[PDB]
Design brief:
Length: 245
C-alpha cells in the first residue's frame, strides 16, 4: 500500500496473509485474502495461477506483521484451492480474478473467533455503495517504488469508489473494465494498492457492518494519476461463492 498508515490486525481482523512454503522452513509472502467463513478465505486467482498446487501454501489469520509473530495468530494449510475456471488475463486486466481457499489448521480445525480474527460480511447481490463512498484496503504490499523490502507492519488506506462509467472513459481504462470489476482511487492519487496487495480486501462499512465489496486485482502502476486500482466486484460472484462453499 502506497500512502496510508500502519495498522494492526485488531483493526482489520478478517485479513488473511497467504505465503508459499519452501524446503527448509522458509516462506515467501504471496498475497492477501479475507476470511468470509470459519473455513473459507477468499483471494484472487492470479496470485496462484502459476503455482496452483494447494500443498505449497500457508495462510495466517490474526497476523499484524509480515516476518514476525503476533500474539494470537493462527496458521492454516490449504485443503482446497479453488480458482475460477474462467479466469484469464489480457494485456491490462485480470478477468474473473477470484479464488477460494479452504483452510485447515495443523490440528484439523477451521478459524476460531477472537479480537484479532473475525469474518467480514459478504455484500448482497448487485448491491454496492454508490461512487464517492469511502472504503478501506489493507495489505503487506510495497509502500514505495524504490523499496526492495515490503513493510513489516500491516498497512491500510482509504480510497473512494469510482463509477463504472468514469472508469470506462478512454483516459482511464476504457473497455478494459467490465461490470464485474470496480474501480477505486484517492481523489489526489496519493494512496493506492501496490505489488503484493492483490487478493486483499476492499471493505466498505454499510450500516455499521463491514462488507467485502472488492478484491484487489490490478491497475496501472501504483498511485498513478487517472489509473485507479481495479478490484473484483464481489457482489457479482455471490452465486459462485455460495455454490463452491
Ligand atoms: C505470483 N505472485 C506471488 C504474485 C504476488 C502479487 C501479485 C500482485 O498483483 O500484487 C502478483 O500479480 C502480479 N504482480 C505484478 O507486479 C506488480 C507491480 C506493481 C504494482 C502491482 C499492483 C498490484 C495490485 C494492484 C495494483 C494497482 N495499483 C498494482 C503489481 C504485476 F505487474 C502483474 N501484472 C502485470 C501484467 C498484468 N496483466 C496480466 C493483467 C498483471 C501481476 F499479475 C503475483
Amino acid at each position: 500500500i502506497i500512502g496510508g498508515e500502519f495498522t494492526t490486525i485488531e483493526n482489520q481482523p478478517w485479513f488473511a496473509a497467504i505465503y508459499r512454503r519452501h524446503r527448509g522452513g522458509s516462506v515467501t509472502y504471496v498475497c492477501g485474502g479475507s476470511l468470509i467463513s470459519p473455513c473459507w478465505v477468499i483471494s484472487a486467482t492470479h496470485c496462484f495461477i502459476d503455482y496452483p498446487k494447494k500443498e505449497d501454501y500457508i495462510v495466517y489469520l490474526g497476523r499484524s506483521r509480515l516476518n514476525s509473530n503476533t500474539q494470537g495468530e493462527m496458521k492454516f494449510e490449504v485443503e482446497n484451492l479453488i480458482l475460477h475456471k474462467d479466469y484469464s488475463a489480457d494485456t491490462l486486466a485480470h478477468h474473473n480474478d477470484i479464488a477460494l481457499l479452504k483452510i485447515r489448521s495443523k490440528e484439523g480445525r477451521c478459524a476460531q473467533p477472537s479480537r484479532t480474527i473475525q469474518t467480514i460480511c459478504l455484500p448482497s447481490m448487485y448491491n454496492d455503495p454508490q461512487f464517492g463512498t469511502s472504503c478501506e484496503i489493507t495489505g503487506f504490499g510495497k509502500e514505495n517504488s524504490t523499496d526492495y523490502l515490503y513493510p513489516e507492519q500491516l498497512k491500510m488506506t482509504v480510497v473512494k469508489l469510482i463509477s463504472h462509467r468514469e472508469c470506462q472513459q478512454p483516459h482511464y481504462y476504457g473497455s478494459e473494465v467490465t461490470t464485474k470489476m470496480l474501480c477505486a482511487a484517492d481523489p489526489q492519487w496519493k494512496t493506492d494498492s501496490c505489488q503484493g496487495d492483490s487478493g486483499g480486501p476492499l471493505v466498505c462499512s454499510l450500516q455499521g457492518r463491514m462488507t467485502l465489496t472488492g478484491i484487489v486485482s490490478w491497475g496501472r502502476g501504483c498511485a498513478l494519476k487517472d489509473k485507479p486500482g481495479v478490484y473484483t466486484r464481489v457482489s457479482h460472484f455471490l452465486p459462485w461463492i455460495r455454490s463452491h462453499t
